[PDB]
Amino acid sequence: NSVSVDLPGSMKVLVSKSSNADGKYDLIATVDALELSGTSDKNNGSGVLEGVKADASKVKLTISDDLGQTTLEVFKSDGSTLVSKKVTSKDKSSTEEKFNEKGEVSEKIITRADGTRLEYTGIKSDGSGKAKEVLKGYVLEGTLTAEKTTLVVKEGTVTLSKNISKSGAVSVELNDTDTKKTAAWNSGTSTLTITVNSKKTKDLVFTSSNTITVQQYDSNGTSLEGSAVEITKLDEIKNALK
């Protein structure tokens, strides 16, 4: 008979309890009402399963050898060109892509383990497109190029730009067309320090938890005061830029 195996991406696979004369195991799965089946030379639920959508599109589920990652793919009805691809990685983050008629990615949604998202849409053949970061309580909007994602918040004459490089490194800059506010970025602590009239006014920390905090300086412009406050809505980023 068969045993159920829990998979990344909210799926389950049934793997036969014993192998066949070829040494191989039967795999069955039901993914959103589609029955998928396959054969594997491993006994743990890893391998490849296949099926079709009601509209004849091919479907393939690939489970990595150690069960750490799953890939759910949809293809044209001949199986030749990708239509969509969802990869759930071992941290349980996911990347969901759609492809055009030439197999070129046209949309990429990244859902981080913490549930925040990067939404890349209207992606063109040069890897440029529109970009949105979806945080807890607010969204940041901007653009994508092959070099970086740039998300922009404007307040008065001040523009705050959060860059995410192609490698994933974050850097933040502030530009004031009136030259009252300036800011310096510390990559080590992911902190933007804003200065007005040669005194520090606030630190904006872009945390590894994908939040932003703001903390004011004392009127002396040198010591932090109080404690950092987590931003919960876009209005509060704008307030920090006033």
State the CB neighbour count (10 A cutoff) for residue 32.
9
Q: Could you write out the three-class secondary structure of 201-242? A: EEEEEECCCCCEEEEEECCCCCCECCCCEECCCHHHHHHHCC
| Nearest Cα residue to 175 out of 108, 241, 231 | 241
| Nearest Cα residue to 14 out of 35, 22, 32, 33 | 35
> Can you say whether the dihedral through the CA atoms of 228, 234, 238, 241 is positive or negative?
positive
Give resolution in angstroms.
1.4
CA 223-224-230 angle, to 5 degrees, is 170
> Can you say whether the dihedral through the CA atoms of 13, 17, 20, 23 is positive or negative?
positive
Number of H helices, E strands in the chain: 1, 21
- Sequence-separated contacts (24+) of 94-102 with Cβ below 8 Å: 94/9
Query: What is 101-242's CATH number, 3.40.109.10, 2.10.109.10, 3.40.190.10, 3.90.930.1?
Result: 3.90.930.1
Cα separation values, 37 from 28, 40, 83, 224, Å: 5, 10, 20, 60
CB contact at 8 A, 171 and 161: no
| Nearest Cα residue to 212 out of 224, 204, 222, 221 | 204
CB contact at 8 A, 45 and 13: yes
| Nearest Cα residue to 14 out of 33, 32, 37, 34 | 37
The yes-or-no answer to whether 1-100 and 101-242 have a common fold is no
Retrieve residue 166's tokens: 């192609």
Query: What's the CATH code, domain 1-100?
Result: 2.40.128.160
CB contact at 8 A, 171 and 165: yes
- Residue 56 is classified by DSSP as S
CA distance 8 to 46: 12
CA distance 58 to 43: 25
Cα separation values, 67 from 8, 31, 74, 93, 115, Å: 8, 17, 20, 14, 21
Rg (CA), the chain: 24
Retrieve residue 136's tokens: 């807890």
| Nearest Cα residue to 72 out of 50, 46, 43 | 50
CB contact at 8 A, 28 and 48: no
The backbone torsions φ and ψ at residue 29, rounded to the nearest 5 degrees and listed phi first, read -150, 150
CA distance 60 to 97: 15
Retrieve residue 199's tokens: 């005194």
CB contact at 8 A, 118 and 109: yes
CB contact at 8 A, 140 and 162: yes
CA distance 105 to 114: 24
State the CB neighbour count (10 A cutoff) for residue 174.
20
Find the discontinuities in the chain where C to next N exceeds 2.5 angstroms and give the residue preceding each: none
Task: Give the three-state DSSP class for 197.
Answer: coil
CB contact at 8 A, 159 and 142: no
State the CB neighbour count (10 A cutoff) for residue 16.
17
List beta partners, residue 42: none
Residue boundaries of the structural domains of the chain: 1-100, 101-242
